[PDB]
Design a binder for this molecule. Structure first.
Ligand SMILES: CCCCCCCC(=O)OC[C@H](COP(=O)(O)O[C@@H]1[C@H](O)[C@H](O)[C@@H](OP(=O)(O)O)[C@H](OP(=O)(O)O)[C@H]1O)OC(=O)CCCCCCC
Ligand SMILES: CCCCCCCC(=O)OC[C@H](COP(=O)(O)O[C@@H]1[C@H](O)[C@H](O)[C@@H](OP(=O)(O)O)[C@H](OP(=O)(O)O)[C@H]1O)OC(=O)CCCCCCC
Ligand SMILES: *[C@@H]1O[C@H](CO)[C@@H](O[C@@H]2O[C@H](CO)[C@@H](O)[C@H](O)[C@H]2NC(C)=O)[C@H](O)[C@H]1NC(C)=O
Ligand SMILES: CC(C)CCC[C@@H](C)[C@H]1CC[C@H]2[C@@H]3CC=C4C[C@@H](O)CC[C@]4(C)[C@H]3CC[C@]12C
Lengths: 786, 101
């Protein structure tokens, strides 16, 4: 901090030589002293200001050109950099650059030289009444300036070639004793106020306002430690907050001014000075029921809308096609001991019971990839050790029930509170990317099976599948997939468009995926010659291998006797499957129940975990797959019932009818075979691409990844942008991308069942390693639950 | 100075003519693809020995579908690069250049 000496200088003309020069007008040491005509300094007075002066000072400071810590020691440099930043910020035109530096480089006169010039008169720059203070204080320095003081120069001029008033605020890195202008103390700050004639603009009053602002201690300190124009603006707003206006009044002027003393003294007083642990057994479960089940009546009445029916038609295919595909693989890898029919019936029953009883009915319950990998591994283990795979599954279920009852009993689902937005978004982005990759690899496999060839064997066997390449199959599949994706996205855009009466637009855009599916299925149906792969459901509700097992499996064995040791050794695979289902379902519930998604009905973690794992364990007895809350399906369900207002999410149709109807349709899918046999897989591939793309909307990781490819100026007004440095946020995003790559490598590795543990290892990263390289404010701005 | 009669052609006739010509252009562009599909229809069986000179003398597999794929891909990439020119991504001088090309 340093004491200040402000100097106001104006562009004038002399009578003797008619030469433009800068003339002393006023100076500030402790109070304002004005220089009048005849060269006598006036009486020191308080620096009163006019209303318009502070008006236009704030106006031109808002668009001000601010240079801080400028490394110049002469006026000519300060003048060249300023006139340059003037051009850079488009304050002035490049043509008037010269004339303005020709003006700024004129001689600076002072009080002693006024008499020798034969008078001084006001002047206006060309491209080629007396002041109130003079009238009231002027008609009739080195000792006062403190030794450790620095000076401010306020340059005020009128230039008719400028289009707008321009403010330039320059702070020097080192205080410089300029040669062009002589002062008792070195110049640090430099105010430049130039512009044309404008209404309500007295440039003398603008300079007086700027000098009074620089004479104030708080603003002087703020300008000393300012690093941007915003800090200077905020200090100016604080200055104007303490500014007091005296309206024209008839009160006796001595008392009128003396009444303002306590108002000033007060005005300057401060200027200068669901996952909580209860501890009760099954407390989380009973709290879950208490929170969700009161809304059961609304869960049936909120479903009476066409959006719910469109969501049913969407999620029906979105849950049936994975069921059919995973049924083919589970069977082809299990010798059909678990196949399409078992998976369909298990999906239907568990979905019906979950929609009827669950606390987050918008979750979609079904088979998944990690469960398929575990089934592969367990079947291989049973084949190696001469074991019965289905009985081992029965015993794995028995242990999963004891596990979910114990974790629900001790409120083990309170540990989900430590999975922050970091792990949630990493898992969501990874799952969406994997979904898109699998969807594209299916089309690649279709192209591989029927490549583009010059010649084809026209007599090929079609049953059960074509025994060789077929013409036009792969190209038509690509066309169908692209057309379905295109139509779905166009109808999604049309839902938010300005076209057609709103109701019909919002009902047509609500039925976007069903209309796209219908259109593309009709297109394929009218193309008869070209073959395309269709959906294939089993013949009837029968087990996939009647020669292997029945509908119920004896825990002691079917064709042999299950060994005693495996009944106890089943805990470890049960532990792994419990970890898989727990992590997947709990993170899915975290994602679908974010506060930003407008979920106002509440979600249940303990109750949903109990229902899912217990139903899986019970279905294991019937030799049926255990299910998990799939992330893509549940996110698509939540988005399909999400209502968008006049953009911004308004509400979500939280109801139990949509999931129940999806489960019922999945169970009935065997019966509705003549309709499902005319639906190509390419249409559903386009639908899967739509789901994978649309699942990326609410993930901040995807937005931050998109920011790395955007100029640091188009970054949105979000707290992780406006409060965090750009490269810091980019480093955060890059660390997340490294985690994504590590998890992707783990997935493609035969140790893909360890993916939950590598995902879990991100929580210690965020809570231990990230504070070592980021500050707390950065981490709260970058990793916020809401 | 018989070209001064053009001043009586207002935005009415100008816009009618331009819209009609654009509609005709799009119509012929689509009818060429329709003719491609007609020349090489989607069939269960094709003769694998078709004389190619000067033009194919019969239906060929994967021709019309690939032509439709190429047309759609060209239109898609052209429109997406036009959108990217006005977009907010990449250093600006590149986004502009890339969008010009
Ligand atoms: C079957 C539907 C139409 C059949 C008859 C066609 C004739 C027909 O129905 O006219 C209705 C409408 C004019 O009537 P009007 O201006 O009253 O209708 C406005 C329209 O529905 C907006 O969508 C509404 O805003 P939003 O979006 O809800 O926010 C707005 O209400 P709000 O702003 O106060 O809330 C409504 O007032 O015309 C068209 O939209 C042109 C498309 C005609 C093409 C018809 C497409 C087939
Ligand atoms: C592959 C490209 C090679 C670049 C390698 C990466 C290295 C690299 O070049 O980035 C730095 C630079 C940012 O620098 P900076 O923000 O200063 O550059 C601004 C940017 O070019 C804007 O696009 C310009 O506005 P507009 O939009 O033209 O109107 C703006 O001009 P103006 O407003 O002042 O007149 C420029 O100031 O580029 C990016 O945009 C960042 C996105 C990087 C993504 C690049 C993709 C990796
Ligand atoms: C149903 O299960 C039986 C027995 O598990 C399968 O019969 C086996 O088939 C495999 C494949 O060749 C071989 O191990 C033997 O031929 C059979 N082994 C036994 C012990 O019978 C039958 O293939 C299964 N059905 C289907 C459709 O996979
Ligand atoms: C945690 C779940 C899986 C239950 C716990 C399993 C263990 C502790 C218990 C539960 C039921 C028990 C079995 C019940 C019946 C029989 C038949 C008998 O002739 C020999 C012992 C045997 C085979 C028992 C062995 C131990 C057993 C498997």
């Amino acid at each position: 901090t340093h004491k200040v000496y402000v100097e106001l200088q104006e562009l004038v003309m002399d009578e003797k030589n008619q030469e433009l020069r800068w003339m002393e007008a006023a100076r500030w040491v402790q109070l304002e002293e004005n220089l009048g005509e005849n060269g006598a300094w006036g009486r020191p007075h308080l620096s009163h200001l006019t209303f318009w002066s502070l008006l236009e000072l704030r106006r031109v400071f808002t668009k001000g050109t601010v240079l801080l810590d400028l490394q110049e020691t002469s006026l000519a440099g300060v003048a060249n950099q300023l006139l340059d930043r003037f051009i850079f910020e488009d304050q002035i035109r490049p043509q008037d650059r010269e004339e303005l530096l020709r003006a700024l480089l004129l001689k600076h006169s002072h009080a002693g030289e006024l008499e020798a010039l034969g008078g001084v008169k006001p002047a206006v720059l060309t491209r080629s009444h007396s002041s109130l203070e003079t009238q009231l204080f002027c008609e009739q320095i080195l000792e006062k300036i403190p030794p450790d003081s620095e000076a401010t120069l306020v340059l005020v001029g009128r230039a008719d070639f400028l289009e707008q008033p321009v403010l330039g605020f320059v702070r020097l890195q080192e205080a410089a004793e300029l040669e062009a202008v002589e002062l008792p103390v070195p110049i640090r700050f430099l105010f430049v106020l130039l512009g044309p004639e404008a209404p309500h603009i007295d440039y003398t009053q603008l300079g007086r306002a700027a000098a009074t602002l620089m004479s104030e201690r708080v603003f002087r300190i703020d300008a000393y430690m300012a690093q941007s124009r915003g800090e200077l603006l905020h200090s100016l707003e604080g200055f104007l907050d303490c500014s007091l206006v005296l309206p024209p009044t008839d009160a006796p002027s001595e008392q009128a001014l003396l009444s303002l003393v306590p108002v000033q003294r007060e005005l300057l007083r401060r200027r200068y000075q669901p996952l909580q642990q209860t501890g009760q057994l099954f407390g989380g479960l009973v709290r879950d029921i208490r929170r969700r089940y009161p809304y059961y009546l609304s869960d049936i009445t909120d479903a009476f809308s066409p959006q719910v029916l469109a969501a049913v038609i969407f999620i029906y295919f979105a849950a049936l096609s994975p069921a059919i595909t995973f049924g083919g693989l589970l069977g082809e890898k299990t010798r059909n001991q678990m196949g399409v029919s078992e998976l369909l019936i298990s999906t239907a029953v568990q979905g019906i019971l979950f929609a009827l009883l669950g606390a987050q009915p918008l979750l979609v319950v079904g088979f998944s990839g990690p469960l398929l990998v575990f089934e592969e591994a367990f079947f291989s283990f049973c084949e190696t050790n001469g074991l019965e795979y289905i009985v081992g599954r029965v015993w794995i279920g028995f242990w999963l029930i004891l596990l979910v009852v114990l974790v629900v009993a001790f409120e083990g689902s309170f540990l989900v509170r430590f999975i922050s937005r970091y792990t949630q978004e990493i898992f969501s982005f990874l799952i969406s990317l994997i979904f898109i990759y699998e969807t594209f690899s299916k089309l690649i496999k279709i192209f591989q099976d029927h490549p583009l060839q010059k010649t084809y064997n026209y007599n090929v066997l079609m049953v059960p599948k074509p025994q060789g390449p077929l013409p036009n199959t792969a190209l038509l599949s690509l066309v169908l997939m692209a057309g379905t994706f295109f139509f779905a996205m166009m109808l999604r855009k049309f839902k938010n468009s300005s076209y057609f009466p709103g109701k019909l637009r919002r009902v047509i855009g609500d039925f976007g995926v069903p209309i796209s599916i219908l259109i593309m299925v009709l297109v394929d149906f009218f193309i008869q010659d070209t073959y395309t792969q269709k959906l294939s459901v089993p013949d009837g509700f029968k087990v996939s291998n009647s020669s292997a097992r029945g509908w119920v499996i004896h825990p002691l064995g079917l064709r042999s006797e299950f060994p005693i040791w495996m009944m106890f050794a089943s805990a470890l695979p049960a532990l792994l499957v419990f970890i898989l289902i727990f992590l997947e379902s709990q993170i899915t519930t975290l994602i679908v129940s974010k506060p930003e998604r407008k979920m106002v009905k509440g979600s249940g973690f303990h109750l949903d975990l109990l229902l899912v794992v217990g139903m899986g364990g019970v279905a294991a007895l019937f030799g049926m797959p255990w299910l998990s809350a799939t992330t893509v399906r549940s996110v698509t369900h939540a988005n399909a019932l999400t209502v968008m207002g006049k953009a911004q999410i308004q509400e979500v149709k939280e109801q139990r009818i949509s999931g129940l109807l999806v489960a019922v349709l999945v169970g009935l899918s065997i019966l509705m075979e003549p309709i499902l046999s005319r639906i190509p897989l390419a249409v559903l591939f386009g639908i899967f691409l739509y789901m994978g793309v649309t699942s990326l909307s609410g993930i901040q990781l995807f937005d931050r990844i998109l920011l790395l490819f955007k100029p640091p100026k188009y970054h949105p007004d979000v707290p992780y942008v406006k409060r965090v440095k750009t490269w810091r946020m980019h480093l955060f995003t890059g660390i997340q991308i490294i985690c994504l790559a590590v998890l992707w490598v783990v997935k493609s590795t035969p140790a893909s069942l360890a993916l939950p543990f590598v995902l879990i290892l991100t929580v210690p990263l965020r809570r231990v390693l990230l504070p070592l390289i980021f500050r707390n404010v950065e981490l709260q701005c970058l990793d916020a639950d809401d």
